Each structure stands twice: as C-alpha cells, then as structure tokens.
Paper text:
The calcium homeostasis modulators (CALHM) constitute one family of large pore channels that contains six members in humans.
The two cryo-EM densities provide congruent views of the relative arrangement and conformational preferences of [name] and [name] subunits in heteromeric channels. In both datasets, the two positions uniformly occupied by [name] (referred to as 1 and 2 when numbered in a counterclockwise direction from the extracellular side) are well-defined and clearly discernable by [name] bound to its extracellular epitope. Similarly, the seven following positions (3-9), occupied by [name], are well defined, whereas the two positions adjacent to the two [name] subunits in a clockwise direction (11 and 10), which contain [name] or 4 at different ratios are of somewhat lower resolution due to the averaging of two different subunits.
Author numbering:
A (entry chain G), F (entry chain D): 37 to 305
B (entry chain H), C (entry chain I): 38 to 305
D (entry chain F): 37 to 306
E (entry chain E): 35 to 306
G (entry chain C): 19 to 306
C-alpha cells in the first residue's frame, strides 16, 4: 500500500518534528512544482528562445506575460497539496506542537508542569502523554488544528482572489477582444494535436523507407499500408526550417490579418 | 473527501466565531468568484470597458444587465450559505461564547460564573460537565434554532426576490415576454453554432499550416470531410472580431429587430 | 439529503411558536411562489397592463381569468401544509406553551405553577421528568388530535372548493365541456408546436448570421435539412410579436370561433 | 507468497545488523541497477562501438553525453527502490539502532543501563525489550524513523532537482530545438519497432526457404501463408552491411539535410 | 495441492552430526534433480553429444566446445540457483544445518547459564523448538544469528550472480565478431527454423503414416482438416540418413562467399 | 473414502510390522509395476515376436534395448509410489521401530527399560507408550523419520542420474542422429493413431455389409452412409500379411532409404 | 477405454456400497462360535452373490451354453474358450474380488472371524489373565467395543493383531489377482493363433457388428410389424422417421430357422480358403 509509504508519521520530539514537517510537506510540493514546469511546453520554447539568440536581444517585459503563465499553471500542484495538508491538519499540529506557551494554556487550572515543557508538548501529536494532561493534550490538539484550518481556508481564499485578479486584468489589458482569444486558444491546442499526429506519420513513413532499402521489404499491418500508400515521403526538412517554428510568439500581425502561431507566420513565407 | 471540508469546531473563546466566519465565508467567497468567471456575460462587459477607453455609454443601460451577472452567479453562495445555516453546526460554534448566562433556562442557578466564556466555548464539542449538560443541551437547541430560523427566512427573502426581479423584468422590458423567449432561444442557438464553428474553422486553418511544413496532414476518416467541405483562404480581421464582442440592448433596424451584435454586424 | 430538511423543536417559550410558523409556512410560502413562476398564464396577464398602460379592460372581464391562475399554483401549498399537520410536528412545537393548564385532567394536580409555560415548552424535545410523562402524554395526544382534526378538514375544504368551482366554471362559461375540452386541448397543443417552430426559426437565423462572419457553418446531419426546409429572410416585427401575448376570452367573428390571439391575428 | 520470502527480518545483534541492513537493501539495488544496464539497448551499441574500432581513437567528449543517458535511464530503478525502503523506515532503524547514543535518550529519566548498552539497544527493532524500557524503545524507534523519513524525502528532492537541471541542460546545450528532437525521438522508436518487426518476418521467410529444401514442402499457418506469398527473399544480408548499422550516431548532417539514425546514414548510401 | 506440498516440506531432525547431512540432501538433491532436467531439455547438449559421436576423432578444439558449453550450463544452472537462493532466504535449511556449531561462549542476552554438559546435543534441538523453557532466550538468539547468516549469504549469492550475468553478457558481445544487432537476427532465425521444422516434421510424418496405412487397409480415414493435409502436402519417399546427418551438430558461423550461413540446415540448403 | 480404506495402520508389534510395511508398500509397488508392463504396447509385440520364431532365431543383444524401454517406462509408478512413502515416513518408522538400539538412544537420561526392549520399542509409532518416555517416542520417531527422508532423497537422486545416464548413452550409442529419432518418434505416434482410427471405420463398414447381407439392409446414423459410400470394402486381409506387420522392428535401410516400421517395410513391397 | 470405465464404475459402486453396508448394518454378534460363522458369511455371501449377477448379466455366457447345448460334443476349440472364459471373468469376477479385498482391508469383517481362535497365552506386555472356562467367551466380546476398561489393555493388541492380519491378508490377495491377470494376458497372446493387432481388430469388429445388429433388429421389428398392420387395416400411420424406414428398407421376409441358429454360438475362426472370417455371422454371408 503506497498510502502507508507516504503516510505522515509525526516524530514526537522537541526541535525535531517541525524540521520534519517542513520536509514532509514542502518536498512533495517541490516535486509537484517541478513536474509542472517540466511538462508544460510553454517553458521549453522560452528556454529555446534563450539558446538561439545567445545575446539576450529580446526584452524581459514582453516575455513576462508568458513567464507568468508557466509558473501560474504549475502553481496548482503546490497549492492543491499545500492546502490539502493544511486542512487535514496533521502536518501543522506536529510542526507547531513545541511552540505552545504553557502559561497561555486554557481549559484547566495552572497545574501544567514546567520542569521540561517542550518535551511534553512535543509528544502531544503521538498521544504519548499521561492521561492527567489529556484535557491539555486535547486542548492544544484542537487549538493547533484550528490555526491550520484557518490558515488553510485563508490559503484557498487568497488563491481565488489571485485568479480573479489575474483573469480580469489579463482580459482587460490584452489587445484582442476575448472572443478572438478563444479562437486563438482553440488554435494552438488544435495545431499541436495535428502537428503531433503527423510527426509520427511522417516519422513512420520515413522509418519504412529506410528499413526497406536495407532488408528489401517492410513488415506492416493492414492500417500501416495506408500510411505508406497515401502519404509518401521524399526527404527530410532542413534544420533551419525546424528552427523557425520553435520559441515564443506574441500576436505579430501581417498586412492587417492575424497570424495566430509562429508556424502560421512561417506558412506565409 | 467530505472529511477534509468537514466542519471541526475549535471550542475556544473569541476564536471559534473567527473559524465559523472563515469556514463559511471563504467557501461562499470561492463559489461567488467561480460564478463570475464562468458567466460569459461579464467578460464582454469587461471588454466593453476596454475598446471605448472613454466611457461614452451611461450606467443606466448597464445596470439592468449588471444585476443579471451577480444574481445569476449568486445562486452558488446562497445554496451554500443555506445548507450551512440549515445544518446548524457552524452557527452554534459561532455564537456559543455569546450566550448570556443570565438568560439560561431549563435549570436552576447552577451554571458557574467563574469563567463563563470558557465554559460556553466548549459546548459545541461535548467538552462539558454532566452537571452542565442540561445547560449545554438547552443552548444546543436554542442556538440551532437561530441557525434553522435564519436559514428559512433567508430562503424566503431570496425567494420573494426571484419573483420580484422576474415580475419587474417582465414589467420593464419593452418587448413582450414570448418574443423574449425567442430571443433567449436565439442566444443559445447562435452561441452553439458559433462555438461549434470555432473548432472547425480552427482545424481547417490548422491543417492548412501543418501541410505547408510537412507536405501532408494526417487526418482520420471523419476529419477528412472537414478539409473538403470547409475550405478557407485566410483569417478574419481584428476589427471584425472587435465588432461582435460586448453588450447589446435591442437596437431595432428599420422595423426589423436584431438580437446579437453579430446579427447587427450581419446587417452591416 | 433528508437530514437537512427536517423539523427540530426549539423547546423555548414564546420562541417555538415562531419556529413552527417559519419551519412550515415559509417552505409552503416558497412553494406557493414556485407555482406562479412556472405557469405561463401569469406573465401574459402581467404583460396585459404593459401594452395598454391605460386600464382599457374593465374589472369584470378580467376578473374571470384571475381565478384560474391562483388555484393552479395553490397545489404546492396544500400538498405540503396538510402533510405536516398530519405528522403534527408543527402544532406540538408551536402551541404547547399556550395550552391552558386548567383544562389538564386525567391526573392529580402535580404540574408546578411556578413555571407552567416553561415545562410545557420542553415537551417536544423529550425533556420531561417521568412524573410529568402523563401530563406530557395527555397534551401530546390532545395536540396531535387537534392538528389532525385541523389537517383533515383542510382536505375537505380543498375537496369542496374544486368541486363547486368546476360546475360553477362550467355553469358560468357559455361553452359546453366538450367544446372546452377541444379548446383547452388546442392551447395545450398549439403552444408546443409554437415552441418547436421557435427554435427552428431561431437556429435558421442563427446559422445565417455565423455564415456571414466565418463563411461556413458546421451543422449536424439533421440540421442540414433545417436550412433547406425552412429558409428565412428576416425576422418578425415587435408589434407582430406583441399581438400574440396577453389574455383572450373567446371572441367570435361572423360565427367563426377564435381560440387564441394568434388565431385572432390569423384572420388579420 | 513470493513477496513474503523477501520480507525484511532484522537480526538484532550489535555490529551485525547494519551489515544485513546494507546487504538486504544494497543488493536488490545492485540487481535493479544491473538490469537497467542490460536491457537498455543504448548500452550495447556503445560496447559494439569500441569493439569494432579496437583502438579507442574517439575521445571522451561524445562518450560522456551518452554515458549519462545510459545510467540516467537505468539509475531511476535503484532510486525508486532505495527511497521506498527509507520511507518504510524498517531498513534504517535496524541498521542504526546500535549507534544510538546512550546519553541522547529522552522521554524518561536516567534508567538506561550501562552494562551492555550497545547490546540492549541492538534488540530494539525486534521488540524484545523489557517492559521497563518500553518508553525508551518507542523514543528511539520514532526518532530513528524520523531520520530515515527525512533522508528519504530529501533524496526525492535531490532527484527532483537533478532531473530538472538535466532536462534544462539537455535542451539548452544541444544544438537542436526541442520540437525537432521530438521528431528525432519519434523516429528512433518508429524505426526500431519496424526493424524488430521486419527482422522476425525476414527470419521466418528465410527459415521457410530452407526447411522446404529439406522436406520438399513447408507447413505454414493460414495467416503465415500470406507472409511467404508477399515478402520473398533472395539471400542474406552481408556482415559488413550489418556492421554499419550498429553503434552510436551523433547528428551527422548530409548536404544540408539531417539524418536521424545511423541506419539512415547508410540509407542514403553513405 | 496441499498434500503434495506437505510431503516435500522441510522436517528438521534435531540431532548432532545428522541434520546437516539431511540439510545437504534436502537442498542439494533437489538442486541436482533440477540441474539434470536443465541439461536434458537444453537442445544444445544433444548435438553437442552428436558432435562427439559422428566425428569419432575429437576434431573440434577446446575453443569451439568452451563457447557452447557455457550456454549449456547458463541456460540450465538458473534452476538450481533460484532454488538454492530461495532456500537460503527462507533460512530454515541453514539453521537446521548449523544448529550444532555455534560457540556457546559467543552467546549473549543471558549470563553464563548455558549448560556445558552436552553442548552439541542441546544446541542441535533449537530448530525443532525442542528446548527447555529456561533457554528460550538462547533458542531465539541462535534462531536469529543463524537466520541472519543464511539471509546474508542468500542476498550475497544473488549479488554475485547478478555480476556474472552482466559480466558474461558484456564479454560475449565484445568478443564475438558479429555486431550485437546481427546476433538478434541470428537468434530470431534459430527459433523460426526450429518451430517451422518441428511443425512441418509432424505433417511430413502424418502423410507418411497415411500413405503406409492406405497400402494395408486399402484406404485411410482422415479428419476434416487432415483431408487438406494429404492433398496439399504430398510426399514421394523418405530422406537418407546422411541427409539427416548433415543437420544435427553444433554450427558456428561459417561464412560463404561473404554471405553468412546461419545454421547447419542453411549451409546444407546451399549444398556446401 | 478410498483413502480412508487404504490408509496405513501401523501394527505395533515386534517382528511383525516390518512384514506389514513391506506388503503395504511393495504390493502397491508391485501392482503399479504390472500396470506399467500391461498397458505398454512394446511389451506385447516383444512377446508376439517370440511366437513366430519359436526358436530364438534373433539374438538377444539387439532386442535388449527394447527391454530397457519397457522397464524404464513402467518403473515410473513404483518409484513415484516408493518415494512418496519414504518421504511421508509412515512406512519406515513402523518398519524399523523395534530395531532402534537402546544404547545409542539420546535426548534423555538412561531410564529405558530392558525387560522388553523390542516390545516397548515396537509400540512407539501408535502412541501406546508411557508418557515418561514420551520424549523418547519423539526422539526415536525423529531419527527414524530422518533415515526415511534421506533414503527418499537419495533414491530420487539416483533415478535422476540414471535417467540422465540412460539418456546420454542412448543418444551416443544409437546409430542415428537425435533428429532422426525425433521424426521416427513422431512417425510412430502418428501411425498408431491413424492405424487405430481406420480400424473403426473398416470394421463398421465391413459389419454393415454382413448385416446388410442378412437383413437385406442396414440402419445407419447420419455419417455412416458417408462411411459406407466413401470407404467401401472389397474383402478382408490375409492373416500372414498381418503377421508381417506385427512384432518388434529395428532400423533397417532399403536402397539407401530408411524404413521406420514393419508396416513401412510391408508397404514398400 | 470403454472397458476400463465400465469396470471402474462397478468397482466404485461396490466400495461405496461396502462403506454404506459397514455403517447401517454390521453388528458383530459377540457370542462364541457365532461371530466366526457371521464373520465368514459377512465376506463370502456378498462375494458369492456378486459373482452370480456377473454371470447372469453377461450376454456371452448364454452364447457358450447355446453352443454347448447345440453341439453336445464340446467341439469348441481351446482358443475361443480361452477368450470367453477370460472375458466373463474379466468383466464379472472383478466385483467379488473388489468387495473381498476392501472387506479385508477395513478389517471389521475379519476381526470377528479369528477372535475365537486367539490364544490367551499368546498375549504379551503382561501375565496372561483369563479363566480356563470363559477365555473363549470373553474374547468373543472384544469386537463389540463394550469390554471393561480393565480388559481394554489386552483388547487393543488383539483387535489390532487381527486387523494387522486382515490388511496383510487383503494385500496378499491383491498380489495374487494382479499376478494372475499379468499371467493370463501373456498366456492369451502366446496361445492365440493371431497377433494382437488381429485380436484388436477382431474384438473391435465384434462390438461394431453386434451394435449394428441390435439397431437393425429393432428397426426390422418395427418395419415388419408396420407392414402387417397395413395388411390388417389397409393403411398405416407413421411418424417422420419410421415412415422413412419402410420406404428405405424392403422386407426380405422371415429368415429360415437354421439361418438364425447358424449365427449363434461360438466362433470357429475357420479361414475361408485363407480369407479370415471373424464371426459366424460373417461366415454365413460369405458362405452364401
């Protein structure tokens, strides 16, 4: 059971668990955050922009709109994991168990020992406390869980406000009516489907034309014969030609009619 | 799961009413913010503030539409505020510390006055002495009454508002209601066909660009008719897009009504 | 689900009787509203004042229509109020504090006179000493009788009201029921095919507008014949639309009975 | 119950379990690491590269860019086993229970004996501890499990950075845009799967061409009869021809056009 | 089968100088039986035998035999190892074997309460639980050290094999004159030829059986599918023993005119 | 059930149970050995071969290898039953219970009575022993059961080697390459299946003619008429011709071509 | 084959019946010189009876009698008698043997038998304690399991030693029948004039002819009866199948009485001038 593997087990110890809780929640967020950048294609072409120029010709301000998109899109993974842990509250209570002031404790009279304070409070999350302090143990358990949930509900509130400000300003300051942007956002996600689809077909066709010249024939299934028959290949596309359809693109217009993707710009020569 | 969003009452003085505010206000706020974004009637309104850059249009025409934005998006917070009030757990945890010890009933003068607020704080969590359980049960019902009381009357004031808004809407709209019904069926019919054509006119332009690169575009059996039946030569000008976005209030043309800016653009 | 919509008595004097009114009347009140909104007869009756703004129609001709509208929507208030009265939950919670202790019998005088109302208020919540269980039981059984007695005669009131009105409606109306059955069927049938024609005529105009913008419209197979079958040129003017909505009471034209304003408009 | 056999059994004995901790975690890691190298086709054409030249003229500049890929595509398997063990915590606690400082125990007063501290601490993972020290064990067990679970999470972080570091350099230092590399990635697999598929068929046709000469006829299934009727062969492929499509290929452009596989380089006749 | 498993299951005889004999038999012999099965099923061992039979002069040197002999054991020594390893990891076999060899003074967890009257006898009784209750702590102590010593060796044995397999695989590719890719085709050819051979041998067997029965009974009875076999695959006679004698024997890549021959049969198909 | 009846029941009695153990093991082995000989077809033509010559015309040496095949094929059942009994150990303990030397007994101080050594040692397997010597009954049982399992494992080992030894020499000493034996074996199995299949068809057709000749007709199922029409009988086959295709057969060549059975030799004319 | 399954069901049938018999109805009469006779009858009587239904139900048995009564000279050759006698026993005499062995194997049948013969002085593990007058009587009560606990010690050894004898005796019986079957099969093939392939073909033919004979005979009865119905009514009503038979099977008539007698009895296996004849029925057709 992988649930038992990644389960949050609180090491009840002073000055030790908050260090653990920091690395038991932040690190999965870091992994989740890293995944978002890696998979999002909007960051490779941004990287690819930095490699071809080798000079830093392009200004930062035009690229900041796209730079905020990769971080923004990938920011769901940390938030949806930072929030879920906070609401569960197990992460926080084990983290902040040892900072509770014994003097400010409530629900009971001043019978809390002060010989070794942090040691007893640190052991609260694991329930390894004498029942004579069970009221104290429960009181801190509830109060600390309260701050987690209050922080958790605050966290989701802040994200919602940020999204509202982001989308409202993005539509306001963009120079295209939002209906056109929907068509544009229905293009880049449509071109990439066709471009990936023909990438294999013009690869497999080029694969068969290589094996055949070696073996003397090519094994194929019933469908693959249609690929060779319908779509013949003659050669390969030049490397600079590949260089002209990678990078970032920001609504460069031609003659008064838009070009929606950098490939479309190259399709006009 | 429901366990994560489940209401856990922190039985503490001057603290739980903060939590109830957050555990109810924020989910209400997050629903309301969701409502605005999804409702497409606000973006063109936002886009309306952009193209003019002058505010030529007065607020009076906008106000009739602006109500339809917040109101149509206010259903989600209301149905979430109601259930929380009807459930009652949030309210009792909210006002437990404000119960007057003097107004306590169903028992003799046995409730301690040493730390009333502290004792009153721990009522929602069953952290109470059995001797005070009668007091706890009394406030467990008196407080739950107010929540269920507030829930029902807040439902009623909402309910009459729907009737008041709808009747006034039919009272103030110059066109007859049955014609408005046709207008409602036209907005859905145009939006679907426009959206359905948005994908197709995107795909045809998509294939007409990949082909220039690879030399051929791989299409399945059904997408093949898309290229054959629907050929395009280019794109549409930005001003042309800029003339069919925004708000529209029943501009009549030579005795012929127009129902959408696109229709108004279709008449030239 | 059903847990949220339930009755829980606040065992408090001068407070529970408010809850009983709120916990039943308001759910009945909203159900009363809902019937009005769904019915289409209200808006045209509402729209009648809009097209005149002068009170052209007198009170006597228009008073006849008002009777039918309220009764149709009155189904929800009566289909719910009597059900709660059958359970008797509202009555026992509401008027328990107002039960006169003098009429209490079938037991010796044991109920305290210090707080008679307060003890009475806590009966529904099962909070009562076993010595007063007899006092609780007698009133609980008495209130359940009165609630059911009240609830049962409500059904009879409904039963007689529909019966007398139906013959009165037949007697008052100058039309035979066989004539009324056909006429009523016409409205219930002409509306349905009016709505279906509305969408088809809505889509056809919608398709034409998009084509003038994109250049081609992506329709399914069934929509393809829609363009071929029903091609339109423009729309219908607002006065033509206005001549449809409103109320109508069986005008006659040279011995030809007309059954709808549309039929009245059909002859020109 | 095959998983039950490989289950961890901590030998509670001083200076002994950490050896077992190593050899019951390292060895399956070593086995998983070796498997990654063996099954990875990119490691054989590396070996066959230095084999046929017999001189090692080529420098380390082209080798290191591939050698990392050999381990990288294979070193993931040991790590996803090394991290899993650390998260479970069983491997570490038994390994290091001997080294716990007898002066660093808390949650109890000075009740730890000093006669054989290492010995008594060694038996903590086996729960064979007298009930007068049950507080001590539940302190050491939970403390050591922290150290493991901290190391496991940290190790995941280091891979979570090395992958992102590598994926950036592999796209910033390579002379090809990523969209072209995806094609070059979609071509290496497209050719190899065709090659394996066509190798099997040209094997069977050659086989059926010899068995016939030994029996006068060949038994073939109904669908296999189509194979012989479609893909006739005339002989075998010479060894030097088989020796020019084995090895490492590094983006040799031809007359201004690219070649994506070493086979492709031979396909143009080079 | 719960009864069959119960028969083979280990039953340690707690007695000195006796159990490790059984432990040797209870693991060694099933390993030996598995190893013998590995030899017989390995088709490469027979044409190896047939090679040592037909030539009668030991024509082949050590190098042609050594390269093949490695494949004989490698494809067969897997079965003993995965049985020896599985036994060691279980640890029951080892603890029964060495229960009479731990040094009493090396024991711990208890003071010098270990009797020295007949040390070997009492130690040997540990695996079968047949121990006095006062030495139950010692019983568990030895029951764990010996489990360890088995388990460490069990894991160590797997590691050594996982090195030899990698070393053997790497050496073969570096030493053979063929490219690794051409060997894959060569491996993909022996399987196709063998499967076609065995399948087509049956058909040329049944036809000969059908032809001979017809001469005796006067006719032959065939199933629906066998009817096609007689017409589609007619035979005229048998094949001489020397013809059968040119295709059974180890073959190591004799190239012809610069074009390879991939098996004895292929060399015969060219009449060489 | 059947297993309950044939369940071993050790007769605890001196000088008597080892007789029972032999019969309760040997007889099941002897019976199973007979079934191996009886069902095997290569044993009857061996006997039938002696019928025709009646004078030992053929030498015993060439026919010896067949005798190696008949014993080897049949011996699987006795061994697989002898081994199972040895591994179970029930047979052996009751067989040798009363032969355990009291002097060599261990795991107990010398309380073993000598008044009836054999008798009390005979009763050990059947729980009819004093509880004061219960540890001995466990000690003697475990040592004896150890001896049984060692013999069982040694026996299966020797059978394992002999199977290999008789299969390494058979290929070596046979005059044919092992592949020819593959065809020869696949031919024999094909011949017998086809030969037996035609016998049913030939008989059913022949019986039809006799019944038709005597009722004037025959009652047939759906496929019988197909059998009658497709395969008509023209008579029977002489006995001496049948005799030429019975009996053992060694590989004999004709004009440089093999003949794989007497039926083949007969079919060649 | 078909023969083995036919025997197997019978072997299972008696074993189950023996298990059923040993539960509901077997109570050893613990009375001297009464259990001994009871024990012997508890084995032989089912054995002798079960052998009898084996003979009666065997069709080939009356074939032997028919020839013996017809020939009155025992002119049947040794080989056909070897075939039939080894056929009936192999098909019938199996059932008593299986009952006999399982009865011995369980031992409750035998333990009653020699309980009388048990020597009081042959007992061990203690001094012999039995009166010279009631020694036989007390032993007879051992199998009932009602013996006093004082005599339980001596009873278990006696009830087991006989149980030892029964299982050993039952096993020894299995050896004899197993050897005999092996001995007979060799004698059957050695003394037969034709090889086993001939014997296989012949016995395989015998089943097919008699199976064909039975099916035809039932049909011939129906068609002959139907034709006489037509003669007695002038019309016949038939279903789909039977009506096809009358149109497809002409009525040859009534066969001569000697012809029926010629096709019953033992088979002389006289080769028709070298051409084999596998039954009397085959000879009759080839004879004419």
């Amino acid at each position: 059971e992988l649930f038992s593997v990644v389960a949050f087990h609180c090491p009840c110890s002073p000055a030790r668990n908050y260090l653990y809780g920091l690395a038991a929640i932040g690190v999965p967020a870091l992994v989740l955050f890293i995944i978002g950048i890696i998979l999002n294609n909007h960051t490779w072409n941004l990287v690819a922009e930095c490699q071809h120029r080798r000079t830093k010709n392009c200004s930062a301000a035009p690229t900041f709109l796209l730079l905020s998109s990769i971080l923004g899109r990938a920011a769901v993974a940390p938030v949806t994991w930072s929030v879920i842990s906070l609401l569960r509250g197990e992460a926080y209570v084990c983290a902040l168990s040892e900072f509770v002031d014994p003097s400010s404790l409530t629900a009971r009279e001043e019978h809390f020992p002060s010989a070794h304070a942090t040691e007893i409070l640190a052991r609260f999350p694991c329930k390894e406390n004498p029942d004579n302090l069970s009221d104290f143990r429960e009181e801190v358990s509830r109060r600390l869980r309260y701050e987690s949930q209050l922080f958790g509900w605050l966290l989701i509130g802040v994200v919602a406000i940020l999204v509202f400000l982001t989308k409202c300003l993005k539509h306001y300051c963009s120079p295209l009516s939002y209906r056109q942007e929907a068509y544009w956002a229905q293009y880049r996600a449509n071109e990439d489907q066709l471009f990936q689809r023909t990438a294999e077909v013009h690869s497999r066709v080029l694969a068969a034309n290589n094996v055949r010249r070696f073996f003397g024939f090519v094994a194929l299934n019933k469908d693959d014969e249609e690929l060779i028959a319908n779509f013949p290949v003659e050669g390969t596309q030049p490397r600079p030609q590949w260089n002209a359809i990678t990078g970032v693109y920001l609504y460069r217009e031609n003659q008064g009619l838009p070009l929606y993707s950098r490939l479309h710009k190259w399709a006009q020569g």
